[PDB]
Amino acid sequence: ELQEKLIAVNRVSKTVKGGRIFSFTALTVVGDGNGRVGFGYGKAREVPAAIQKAMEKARRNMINVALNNGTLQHPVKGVHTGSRVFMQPASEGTGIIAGGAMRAVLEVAGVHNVLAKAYGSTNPINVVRATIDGLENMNSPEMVAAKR
Amino acid sequence: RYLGPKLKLSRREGTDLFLKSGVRAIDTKCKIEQAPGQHGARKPRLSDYGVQLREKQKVRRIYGVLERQFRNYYKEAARLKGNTGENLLALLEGRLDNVVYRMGFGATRAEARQLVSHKAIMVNGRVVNIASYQVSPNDVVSIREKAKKQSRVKAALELAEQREKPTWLEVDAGKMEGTFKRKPERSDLSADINEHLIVELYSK
Amino acid sequence: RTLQGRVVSDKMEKSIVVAIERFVKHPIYGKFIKRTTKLHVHDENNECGIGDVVEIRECRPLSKTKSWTLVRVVEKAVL
Amino acid sequence: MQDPIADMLTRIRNGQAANKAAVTMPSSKLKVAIANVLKEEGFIEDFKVEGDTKPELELTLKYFQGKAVVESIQRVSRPGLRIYKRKDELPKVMAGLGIAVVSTSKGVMTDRAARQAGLGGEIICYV
Amino acid sequence: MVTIRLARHGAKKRPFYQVVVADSRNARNGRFIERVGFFNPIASEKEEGTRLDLDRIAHWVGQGATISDRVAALIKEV
Amino acid sequence: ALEACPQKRGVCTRVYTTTPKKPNSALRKVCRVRLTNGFEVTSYIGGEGHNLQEHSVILIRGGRVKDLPGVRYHTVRGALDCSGVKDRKQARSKYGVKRPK
RNA sequence: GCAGUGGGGAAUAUUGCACAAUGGGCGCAAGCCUGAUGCAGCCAUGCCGCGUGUAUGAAGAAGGCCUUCGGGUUGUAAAGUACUUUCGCGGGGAGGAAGGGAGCGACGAGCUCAUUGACGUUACCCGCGAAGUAGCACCGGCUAACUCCGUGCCAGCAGCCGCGGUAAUACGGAGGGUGCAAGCGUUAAUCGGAAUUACUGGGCGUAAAGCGCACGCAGGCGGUUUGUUAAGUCAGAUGUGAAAUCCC
């Protein structure tokens, strides 16, 4: 069934009036591997409490990547905040060559081969979004033909 | 290679790795179950990066290989088609030194690596003294005619009798030969490894 | 070699200078660049005058600066 | 103008933005040659030569629910810097979903049309 | 003086000479004009000890190309 | 180092002591050295005790002392007149101190 | 010029052996010359199969190490034994090249035969055969690897963020641990990350940044139609594509 992947976890600390309250954050990637992905980022006092809460949010917000022979349709360049992400399809026998933040989202996405890179800001939280955003702008011939 | 105390790596990995006398009740992991050092008794606190790290660790420890080639083979297996995890074990399981071990010619991969380097092992006639040699299917791996006398292999193959071999292999105690049928799948291999945890680590 | 240029001067005798111009791409940028060169062609018959766009061909070095000679006049005049 | 081709392309990129039925554009053999691929591919209904005294190209644009028949369309080869691609340089516009018009000796054709013929040329524009 | 001698590819445990027609000035293992064959002292790599290619050298012979003493022996063996 | 050389010799001009900055307070041992490069810079003297006089002549390594603003070089003990630290049980690789029998 | 000496410097070696082989000069040839070169020596400076060991080994009574003082760890024992099998000794002794000479033939071609092995004895093979040293750096974070004791903004640590005023894992010591497995650390030097000159990859209202304006030369750019030339541009063939290399 659905498969999860922990991108990264941050301690996170804020100076609240009365002392220091700690709240852990966590980036999770839920995906079956045949065309669906899900990014979640929830907070919690405990690490596991955030991990679980994150996976729940990731499964609530999923997208459908139109995979084609273990690859993507056309190249895309998503630009979230200061961060930037680019994607480019590649023939078989290539391998998911990209950042851990993107690869983890691509592996579960079902993508078998793809070339990518991060530009501008490289924030792990901003790159994942730019990644899922680019996976949305993705279109197929049937879509471009039907929508036209 | 590491070259050193292997009976300590087993406990450290939590799992009982087969380095040598893993069969006898002498294996420290059987007497005491905990990593080496003084902090082996205290309750460990592993993290995400921890499970993945210690995961590939035992993986590379089993075959006893450097971190370089182990990483190189990962890139390759991850390049070709098919599930990476599956291909991974395939390449590592294809190593000559490894094959020799599975065949029974050597008590372990460490001893097997030695046998190969000592030119005491041949492949399809011609001899091969490189442990990092990739053994393909239909390739026969037998002992050297001159090495057919050394007591070491004489005792190893002697114990090999009656002992079953993997489905991806087939040896002949009599001729002291062997054949590499095909590439072993994750189903055939029963290693205490989680191919999905080792891949995530290299993802970062 | 045949080169095309203009007669920017006919002061000397039997010696006319032809200003040949060419267009070549920049080795780095690639954009076309304009470059000309003055060649002292021979004209014993003092036929060619200033403003004449004639053709130039390689011939026996009449001198150190002159190694070309007038062949044919393309047009009549364009000062 | 500076680059008639770019003008036409823009005058069409504009008409579609305002959802105009038809758009005018000064005629030209090259222009017509282009409009020929736009109608065949399915970017436009068709076109017709109009003009009382001045030759024009009444282009009849078509639309659909959702996105326009021509989302993007821009010239990559301008007079300031011409570009030429070889048989293996022809880039597949949007994984093939879209096409690119190139001017070769064989005549004005698209990526697939030029790829088949086995020749390359100046990349007019992408659509 | 154009001469036809042997070009030693000589390597640790690998003796192979290349009967080539080159100028006498050029080094023993320098730029040669054209190879006409090869020579294997031990003749272990291949069964074909040498391949003179008569017709080839037959051209240089008379063109002014002189053959050394050693090479002449191999050449004569054809 | 001028010639971008790993090490450079030089004759000491004066072996005086200096005091750390605001966050610290002590008597760090330094010495002005006239490297063959033609420059007269100050170098720090590692160890709990040295034997550098006026005509010391010691090889300079190159290291900035966060405590002493200016001392961008360190002295290589164990070379030339700079006798290595005595009874150095730990840092022997540095300061130059032969392993006792 | 080769080897070497002294000086300088942080610092880099045998004033060794020898010509048979390959190659070169001269001679018809015989043959002569040739530290060109072929080797050995000194220095782990580097790389490859073994720095402080390899393999074997007792539910494990000592010692070193760590410790929440329960324990755990080093587990040839921390003893021994054997080892990959070093070193060392004896014998044989390579070319990864055959002639010079002599016999047959016109001491020419060709054929045949003999001497000489390492370079005026290394490698490798065979035999014998003793286990036969071991240390440094570091352990707050980046950097993988822990506490007790001492001291106490005291003494000291620090590339940056910092730490130390009686619980300091970053001070000194000790037990333990990580790294190196003579490498690993350290110092010095070269390249990119920097899309921070950005042709591919960039900006100029307020962050660094548009000339105060007009006008105007060169230059850049510039409507449309036709013809000739076709110099630029593009295409085919051919020559060179220095060799070497980059790439496969």
Curated annotation (Swiss-Prot), chain A:
InterPro entries: Ribosomal_Su5_D2-typ_SF (IPR020568), Ribosomal_uS5 (IPR000851), Ribosomal_uS5_bac-type (IPR005712), Ribosomal_uS5_C (IPR005324), Ribosomal_uS5_N (IPR013810), Ribosomal_uS5_N_CS (IPR018192), Ribsml_uS5_D2-typ_fold_subgr (IPR014721). Changing V12E: In strain: SPCR7; spectinomycin resistant. Not a ram mutation. PROSITE patterns: RIBOSOMAL_S5, S5_DSRBD. One of its GO terms (cellular component) is cytosolic small ribosomal subunit. Changing R103G: In strain: NEA-314; neamycin resistant. GO terms for molecular function: rRNA binding; structural constituent of ribosome. Keywords: Acetylation, Antibiotic resistance, Ribonucleoprotein, Ribosomal protein, RNA-binding, rRNA-binding. One of its GO terms (biological process) is ribosomal small subunit assembly. Gene3D superfamilies: 3.30.160.20, 3.30.230.10. Part of the 30S ribosomal subunit. Contacts proteins uS4 and uS8. With proteins uS4 and uS5 encircles the mRNA as it enters the ribosome, which may play a role in mRNA helicase processivity. Can be cross-linked to mRNA. In collided ribosomes contacts ribosome rescue factor SmrB. PANTHER family: MITOCHONDRIAL RIBOSOMAL PROTEIN S5 (PTHR48277:SF1). Belongs to the universal ribosomal protein uS5 family. This is Small ribosomal subunit protein uS5. It comes from Escherichia coli (strain K12).
Curated annotation (Swiss-Prot), chain D:
GO terms for cellular component: cytoplasm; cytosol; cytosolic small ribosomal subunit. One of its GO terms (biological process) is regulation of translation. One of its GO terms (molecular function) is rRNA binding. SUPFAM superfamilies: Ribosomal protein S8 (SSF56047). Belongs to the universal ribosomal protein uS8 family. This is Small ribosomal subunit protein uS8. The gene is rpsH. PROSITE patterns: RIBOSOMAL_S8. NCBIfam families: PRK00136.1. Pfam families: Ribosomal_S8. It comes from Escherichia coli (strain K12).
From Swiss-Prot, chain E:
The keyword Translocase does not apply. InterPro entries: Ribosomal_bS16 (IPR000307), Ribosomal_bS16_CS (IPR020592), Ribosomal_bS16_dom_sf (IPR023803). GO terms for biological process: cytoplasmic translation; ribosomal small subunit assembly. Pfam families: Ribosomal_S16. Keywords: Endonuclease, Hydrolase, Nuclease, Ribonucleoprotein, Ribosomal protein. Induction: Part of the rpsP-rimM-trmD-rplS operon. It comes from the Bacteria. GO terms for cellular component: cytoplasm; cytosolic small ribosomal subunit; small ribosomal subunit. This is Small ribosomal subunit protein bS16. In addition to being a ribosomal protein, S16 also has a cation-dependent endonuclease activity. In-frame fusions with the ribosome maturation factor rimM suppress mutations in the latter (probably due to increased rimM expression) and are found in translationally active 70S ribosomes. Part of the 30S ribosomal subunit. GO terms for molecular function: DNA endonuclease activity; four-way junction DNA binding; structural constituent of ribosome. PROSITE patterns: RIBOSOMAL_S16 (PS00732). Belongs to the bacterial ribosomal protein bS16 family.
Swiss-Prot record, chain F:
GO terms for molecular function: misfolded RNA binding; rRNA binding; structural constituent of ribosome; tRNA binding. The modification N6-acetyllysine is found at K86. GO terms for cellular component: cytoplasm; cytosol; cytosolic small ribosomal subunit; ribosome. The modification 3-methylthioaspartic acid is found at D67. Keywords: Acetylation, Antibiotic resistance, Methylation, Ribonucleoprotein, Ribosomal protein, RNA-binding, rRNA-binding, tRNA-binding. Part of the 30S ribosomal subunit. Contacts proteins S8 and S17. Interacts with ArfA. May interact with IF1 in the 30S initiation complex. With S4 and S5 plays an important role in translational accuracy. This is Small ribosomal subunit protein uS12. The lineage of its organism: Bacteria, Pseudomonadati, Pseudomonadota, Gammaproteobacteria, Enterobacterales. The gene is rpsL. The chain holds residues 23 to 123 of 124 of the full protein.
